[PDB]
Amino acid sequence: MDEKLLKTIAESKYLVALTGAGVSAESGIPTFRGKDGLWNRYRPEELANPQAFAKDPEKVWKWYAWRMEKVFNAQPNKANQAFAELERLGVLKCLITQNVDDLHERAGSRNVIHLHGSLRVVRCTSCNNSFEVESAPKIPPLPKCDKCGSLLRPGVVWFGEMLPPDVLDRAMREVERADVIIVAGTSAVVQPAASLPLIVKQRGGAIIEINPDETPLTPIADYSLRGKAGEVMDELVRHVRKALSLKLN
Ligand SMILES: Nc1ncnc2c1ncn2[C@@H]1O[C@H](COP(=O)(O)OP(=O)(O)OC[C@H]2O[C@H](O)[C@H](O)[C@@H]2O)[C@@H](O)[C@H]1O
Ligand SMILES: [Zn+2]
Numbered sequence: 001m002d003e004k005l006l007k008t009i010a011e012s013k014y015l016v017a018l019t020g021a022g023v024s025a026e027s028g029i030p031t032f033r034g035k036d037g038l039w040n041r042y043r044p045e046e047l048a049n050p051q052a053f054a055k056d057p058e059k060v061w062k063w064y065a066w067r068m069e070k071v072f073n074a075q076p077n078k079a080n081q082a083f084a085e086l087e088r089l090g091v092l093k094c095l096i097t098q099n100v101d102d103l104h105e106r107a108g109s110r111n112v113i114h115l116h117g118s119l120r121v122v123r124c125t126s127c128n129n130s131f132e133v134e135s136a137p138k139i140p141p142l143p144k145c146d147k148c149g150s151l152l153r154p155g156v157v158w159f160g161e162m163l164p165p166d167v168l169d170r171a172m173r174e175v176e177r178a179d180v181i182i183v184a185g186t187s188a189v190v191q192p193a194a195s196l197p198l199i200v201k202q203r204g205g206a207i208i209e210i211n212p213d214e215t216p217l218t219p220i221a222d223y224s225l226r227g228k229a230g231e232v233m234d235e236l237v238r239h240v241r242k243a244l245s246l247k248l249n
Pocket of ligand 1: 019020021022023025026031032033034037098099116184185186187188189190210211212213215227228229230
């Protein structure tokens with residue numbers, strides 16, 4: 001929270017952000033890793049991969065329907081509001097997220113890229129039918145496609161699956177032109193998402209990491225703020241808004 005940091009953000013020409021589960025934590029949604037992380041209680045090998053889904057689609061669907069209900073009923077937090085505001089001010093150009101929740105959207109964020117899909121989306125395992133839901137389905141019975149009758153599945157990316165090419169490519173273009181990237185609430189271990197901030201640095205840009213813990217990205221982060229996204233982003237955006245308002249124009 002020094003002058004240089006504020007300056008780096010306020011004067012940026014193309015600032016982007018990469019967010020992870022930590023940015024939704026203050027909305028009552030647990031993260032995947034860490035203390036009370038979902039992967040520390042539930043096994044990703046049974047709930048986050050095509051093999052597990054094929055083996056027991058009812059169990060996987062029951063788990064996702066539960067997660068969907070949790071997310072749809074949660075409200076965006078201060079971190080979410082701050083990111084939307086930073087975009088409103090014209091500073092944040094694009095928000096790249098690994099989150100499958102829609103808290104960024106409900107806070108007002110517009111240019112959001114969902115690298116790993118979205119819990120709002122349901123798609124067919126056979127044909128190209130896909131659509132969004134307003135609330136979570138009840139399981140059983142297994143959600144079936146109204147077009148061909150095959151099993152439907154959550155529109156999220158599982159381990160071993162390829163992120164949609166057009167989606168990752170868009171994110172790639174964003175980080176290739178960003179001079180500053182805010183990396184908040186992510187453990188920086190899951191690929192290829194974890195590689196995006198490196199692009200910014202390699203091309204000459206700056207990395208501003210926001211996370212209560214240190215991660216594999218910390219060593220190359222120009223700035224690494226040890227705190228919660230809500231508190232840090234709220235203060236950061238407020239100072240940036242103040243700085244911009246002070247400009248003689
Ligand atoms: N209030 C908070 N503010 C900011 N960061 C926080 C907060 N609370 C926790 N964190 C940080 O959030 C990070 C979350 O790490 P992960 O649980 O691994 O979430 P993420 O990096 O988004 O996961 C990547 C991907 O893997 C998952 O399988 C899934 O597909 C996911 O998108 C942690 O480093 C943690 O310290
Ligand atoms: Zn179908």
